[PDB]
Each structure stands twice: as structure tokens, then as C-alpha cells.
Amino acid sequence: NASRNAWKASGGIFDIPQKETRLKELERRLEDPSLWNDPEAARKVSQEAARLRRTVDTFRSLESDLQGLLELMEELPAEEREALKPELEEAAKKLDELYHQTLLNFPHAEKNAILTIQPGAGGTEACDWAEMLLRMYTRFAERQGFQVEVVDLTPGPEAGIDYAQILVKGENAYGLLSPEAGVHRLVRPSPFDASGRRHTSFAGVEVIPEVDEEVEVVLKPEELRIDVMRASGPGGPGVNTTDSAVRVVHLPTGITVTCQTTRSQIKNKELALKILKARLYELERKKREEELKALRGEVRPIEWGSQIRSYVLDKNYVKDHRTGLMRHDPENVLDGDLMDLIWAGLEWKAGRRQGTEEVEAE
């Protein structure tokens, strides 16, 4: 297990010098009496002190399992050297906590997730590749300990999928499948091509947890104003002296509506409200779109080069264009070996591009 040591060790090492200088500018700010006088402004101050716990603990735990472990173990069959191995069996136990406490910090990492696959540039082979990816994440779920349900799926003309969607249950379902965003790339001699030469094919992937609803709470009586007024058109003296028309404007949203199709004020006041309900439902569905579709991807051309990870079956090599990381087993990776990818490199760069954005300028 000496191949993942320096990876996890140095992983908690780059936070040492940076947080060292910042916590110093804060800890000395917590001294002067004039600081705490600020109401909630001072909470943001003592808050950063609540981080000197989830940083100094590694300065002690990770540093001790590096100074003591690396010593007595350089050479010996099983005497005092192999006996020092179980001494750090908890070093892999504690490795779990440092890894976890940097993934759940995502928006909704803890809850489940939905993953929709859809073919793209690459002809009918691309339509066939999508089913491969489906069968990849599917096995990756069971083997991760997750449950799976195909929420929807549609076979292609000759391939096997023009579209597919799969809800993965279990904790951190959105966390692990997060870096699976974007279009992947496939390279291999096309099984559908007569000359069988090497063709490229693409396919997009998306991930997102889940939400709820709120239909009636909107039509709170406190919000909208209701008006009464005589009706336009026929009626006799009854129409002139009896106001039955109604105008139910929604004050906040400003959207108004008027009705007077029936001789009655209540049945108009009633209808005019069922009408406002429909429009206010269609106004909540429009705003319900940006906050449930912008999370998918701010782009995703699915074209060429829009990919973030290529899988070449000719020369046998996958490659994450994000971490620059490489590999030599596309045949197994497209079966469940996503852990090696998501764990070390994927979640890293994923949180890195946002973790370097906040701790600098954003």
C-alpha cells in the first residue's frame, strides 16, 4: 500500500503552509476587546477558529504516522518490522476521515443522485457506447454498495440507447458520481463500419440529487388583493347596480386577472382564483428551471473536444484530460474501476477548481 501513501500524505500537506499564515491573521484578531463588540460580524471571526481543529488534527495525526511508520519497516521478514505494520492499520482507518471531510462539503453530496446518459457526436457507434457507460456506472453502484433503479431507458434503432437515466440510491450517491459530469470520449475501430477503421464517438453524462414542491402556499390571502366592480355588458338594472366582476391581482408578482362570466360575485371570485393558480404555477415552473438545470452544466457541447476523459481501446489507455492523469486498462475501467479515478484525482480537481476559487478571489 506504499503507492497511495505519499498521495494521501502530501494531500494534507499543501494545506499546511497556506492555512498556517491565515489562521495567524485570525487568531491575533480574536484578542482585542474591540473585536467581539461587533454583533454577528464577530461570529465570522471566531468561526475560522473552528477550522483550526480540522487542520491541526492532521498536523498531528498525519505527521506522526509518517515519522514513526517510515522508520522501523525498511527491512525484516516478520519480526519487529511486520509488527509495526498493524500499528498503522488505523492509519488507513483515519485516512477515511480526511478523505470524507472534503467531499461532503459539496452542496448536496450526502443525498442520492440522478444520472442521465445521452449519445452524441460519433454516429450509431456513439449510440452503442452510451449503453456501455450505463453498464459501467450500473456495476459501479452495486460494487460501491449502492442500489439502482432505471428511471427511464430507450433502445436505439440498431444500437441500444438513444437516452437513459438511472437513479442511484445510498449516501454520497451525488458525491462520487459528481466528477462523472461532462462528455466522455471513445476511440476504437467501429463495429458498425464496413471498412472498420478507427472512429471516435462521444456521449454526455449528468448528475443531480432531488427536490420537492409548493403549490398552495403561494396563494396566501395576505399576498393578493381582490377588487369588485360593476360588469360590462347586458344584465338589466341588476348589472348596473350589482357589481359581480372581480379583479384578483397578485401584489408581489404583479400579475393580475379579471373575471365576470357568471351572474355571481362568488363564482367569479372563485373562477378568477383558479385562473390565477394556473398562471402562478406556470410562473413557478419557469423559475424552477434555472435552479434545476443550471446545475447540470454551464455548457456541454457534446461535440468534438467537449470531452473530459478519453477511452482508447486500440492502444488500451484511458485518460482524464482534467487531472492529466493516465491509465492502462480501458477494458476494466468500463466495468467498475471508477474508484481509482474519482478517489485520488477526480474529486480532487473537482473541488480544487472551486476550492482555489474561493480561497483567492470569488
Binding site: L30, E31, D32, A49, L52
Partner: protein, 147 residues
């Protein structure tokens, strides 16, 4: 003669020490030189081990302090036979331990000189009492006897 402007209650291990709060704002808004004042803190913590030693502070007018180290809380005695670092969330129903009537007696001797409570007979009920409300009930034998 003596002098005091504002007292305060602080805690810390019997040896190690750090300027961070809640001890932070303390030795910063009243002054406390770690160049000589702390050298009166390590003298009584060199031979003695570590514990929940709460320094019953008493700041003077001249920024100085009274490093008279007082005995740990009566709750430090329960987590000595058990080994816990907390306490039950509901003292009454559940139970995090069961220190016998003997444990409460042996380590409680340390608490009498600092406390104002009388003999070891009186210093016995206090420690068991500081356990009646922290999720635990003692078990004894001699007890009443009576006529």
C-alpha cells in the same frame, strides 16, 4: 495588602498550553506575559501529570495574576475509573457508567483541601452527587446499618 480588578475562571492541561481561546481573549484584554508568568505555571506541572486542572484565576490591577492552581472538577473523578471524555445526554434514564461507592471515596481525598467542605465523610456525598446528574448511579454495601 493586595489588589484585584476583575476575576475570571479558566481551564487547561497540567503542562501543555496554547494562546488560543477561550484562554486567548483572556491573556490579551488584561495582559499576561508568557515570558515570566507562565514559568510559574510549569513549576507545578513538571512533576505532576496532566488533568482537568482549573486555575482559579484572580487578576490584579497591575495586569498580573494569581497562579494558585486549584483542584479539578468533581466530574474529573467519574471519568477516572471509567475513562470517558463526555457524559450521558440524559442523567436519569440511560447510564454511561457505574463507578462503585469505593471509587468515589478513594480519589475524592484530593478534593478536600481546596474545598470548604469538612471531613471525608462529607466530601463523600458531593462526588457521588456530582454523578447523580451526569448519567450514573453508585453501588455500595456498608451504608446505613443503623441500630
Amino acid at each position: 495588602m493586595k489588589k484585584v480588578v476583575a476575576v475570571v475562571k479558566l481551564q487547561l492541561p497540567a503542562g501543555k498550553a496554547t494562546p488560543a481561546p477561550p484562554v486567548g481573549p483572556a491573556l490579551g484584554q488584561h495582559g499576561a506575559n508568557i515570558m515570566e508568568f507562565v514559568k510559574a505555571f510549569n513549576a507545578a506541572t513538571a512533576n505532576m501529570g496532566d488533568a482537568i486542572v482549573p486555575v482559579e484565576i484572580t487578576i490584579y490591577a497591575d495586569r498580573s495574576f494569581t497562579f494558585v492552581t486549584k483542584t479539578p472538577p468533581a466530574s474529573y473523578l467519574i471519568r477516572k475509573a471509567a475513562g470517558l471524555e463526555k457524559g450521558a445526554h440524559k442523567p436519569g434514564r440511560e447510564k454511561v457508567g457505574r463507578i462503585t461507592w469505593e471509587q468515589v471515596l478513594e480519589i475524592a481525598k484530593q478534593k478536600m483541601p481546596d474545598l470548604n467542605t469538612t471531613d471525608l465523610e462529607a466530601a463523600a456525598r458531593m462526588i457521588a452527587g456530582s454523578a447523580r446528574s451526569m448519567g450514573v448511579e453508585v453501588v455500595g454495601a456498608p451504608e446505613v446499618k443503623d441500630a
